[PDB]
């Protein structure tokens, strides 16, 4: 279903609160994003990890140069956090993503996996900044 | 759902500060920061 898949969709507004938070390769790795490829067609890709690009760009108020190593079945390339859209996974896009996953041979993640992974972002949002992370963030 | 929005000292940048947290700004890092105007019905009589 597309409705259950949109629970872990990392919108463009949520990513602005974890631009310098540690453990970025643990909570983010597993969710899906509607990266804009482009004319209005979109392609859902899996978050394999985290990369850093050499180009610095501004995203509204804040600004980050980090990349996002995504992959849609087999085609993989470097992307940016500015091209991500806030729209939800449509039925056509969901069917295209399912077909790409079936063709690539990657097993579809189980429903329990998404159910237990959606809580990671919720628990990280309310995380008390008691340790020594503010200094790294400001630096 | 009010995260107690505060304003930095010199940078004048909005910061979300909760209880049991150090009072430091999201960048640079200072120790002085003020609050925002209330949302109440501030109504004066021009007398």
């Amino acid at each position: 279903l597309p409705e259950e898949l949109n629970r872990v969709r990392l919108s463009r507004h949520k990513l602005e609160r974890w631009c310098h938070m540690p453990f970025f390769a643990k909570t983010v790795t597993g969710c899906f994003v509607r990266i804009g490829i482009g004319k209005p067609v979109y392609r859902v890709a899996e978050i394999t990890g985290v990369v850093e690009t050499a180009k610095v760009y501004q995203l509204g108020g804040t600004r980050t140069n980090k990349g996002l190593q995504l992959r849609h079945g087999n085609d993989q390339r470097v992307f940016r956090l500015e091209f991500v859209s806030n729209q939800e996974f449509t039925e056509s896009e969901f069917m295209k993503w399912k077909e790409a996953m079936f063709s690539a041979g990657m097993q579809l993640p189980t429903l329990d996996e998404i159910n237990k992974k959606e809580l990671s972002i919720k628990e990280a949002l309310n995380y008390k900044f008691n340790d020594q992370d503010i200094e790294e963030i400001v630096k | 759902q009010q995260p107690m929005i505060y304003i930095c000292g010199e940078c004048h940048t909005e910061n979300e500060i909760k209880s049991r947290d150090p009072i430091r700004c999201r960048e640079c890092g200072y120790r002085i920061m003020y609050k925002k105007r209330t949302k109440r019905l501030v109504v004066f009589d021009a007398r």
């Binding site: 919108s11 463009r12 507004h13 949520k14 990266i35 804009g36 490829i37 482009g38 004319k39 509204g60 992307f79 500015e82 091209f83 991500v84 859209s85 806030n86 729209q87 949002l125 | 759902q1 995260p3």
Partner: peptide, 17 residues
Amino acid sequence: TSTYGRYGSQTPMYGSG
């Protein structure tokens, strides 16, 4: 205050660049 999108702020595409 999770995501005040209200759509968005004109999201850029990859190939336009």
